[PDB]
Amino acid sequence: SLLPVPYTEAASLSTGSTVTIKGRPLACFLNEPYLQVDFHTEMKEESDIVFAFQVCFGRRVVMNSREYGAWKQQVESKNMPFQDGQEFELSISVLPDKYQVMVNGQSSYTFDHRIKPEAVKMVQVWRDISLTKFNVSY
Amino acid sequence: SLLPVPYTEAASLSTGSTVTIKGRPLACFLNEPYLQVDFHTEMKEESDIVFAFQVCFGRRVVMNSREYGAWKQQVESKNMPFQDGQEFELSISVLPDKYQVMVNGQSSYTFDHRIKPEAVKMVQVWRDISLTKFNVSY
Structure with a gap:
């Protein structure tokens, strides 16, 4: 639909973002479409990822970081608030100790900071979705 | 690039296609982009899949069928002829007993027919690729 996918936007994050x-x-x-949101340390797509959030719709969510080019300890959740065929609203808030992922207004996943969120310079949203809104609070 | 993705085309297959x-x-x-090619029994995306071919680039290939709405016995290969950052040419030939998947001119994967290829009515190509050519021999 509206925004290009893969969608890439420079970004700065801190507690409260x-x-x-x-x-x-x-x-x-x-058909198990995917959604991925990656918080990158540089504008380059190959740069490190402080927080990778990957949904396999209807199946599972996996979260991880990529540090010095290597994927680290994967975390998995079977929580699946996303609804088949529906538009979703996803909100990722930076808390002091972790990211909080809200889906359609409900807290659904968390991921402890492995790297300070101030290291983030870019966010990418991609895989099997159409995208109508992307907003970072500043 | 040129063709829309997800790309869907009605198709008929038999030995020699x-x-x-x-x-x-x-x-x-x-970043582990995916590629998937699905041979469907009907034009609907939710219809059964005689042969699903899913590449996780740089990591693995998984192949399966979806029969009466249920995924069956997954088959996995770590063969990875695809080259990072490069355009690929993929050729799926229908042999009497199996599909043969050629990548850039080299035989790379096979998958025995679980359902006759004459059951196919539609092919879908999707996930994290741009597509410049899709052709079925008739």
Whole structure:
């Protein structure tokens, strides 16, 4: 739809920052479309990732960091508030100790800071979604 | 680039048919973009899949069928002829007993027919690629 995907935007984050995303999966959940949001340390797509949030719709969520080019300890959740065929509103808030991921207004995932969020310079939203809103609070 | 992705095309297959695809991953291999080619029994995206071919670039390939709405026995290969950052040419030929997947001219994967290829009515190419050529031999 509206915004280009992969969507890349420079960004600065600290405690109190929120990244809000509105979009819709490109396929029914039976086909397991993905959604990924990556908080990068540089504008380059190959740069380190402080927080990677990857949804396999209908199946699971995996979260991780990529540090010095290597993926670290993967974390997995089977929590699946996303609804088949529906638009979703996703909100990632930077708390002192962690990211809080809200889905359609409900707290759904958390991920402890492995690297200070001040290291983030860029956010990328990609994989099997259409995107209508991307906003960073400043 | 040129063709819309997800790309959907009605198709009929039998022994001797070849599906040729030219495209390029949308991200470096470090980011693990996917490619998927699905041979569907109906035009609907939720219909059964006689052969699902899913590349996680730089990591693995998984192949499966979805029968009566249920994914069946997954098959996995770590063969990875795809080259980071490069355009690829992918060719899926229907042999009497199996699909043969050629990558840039080299035989790379096979998948035995679980359902006759004559059951196919539609092919979908999607996930993290740009697509410049899609052709079915008739």
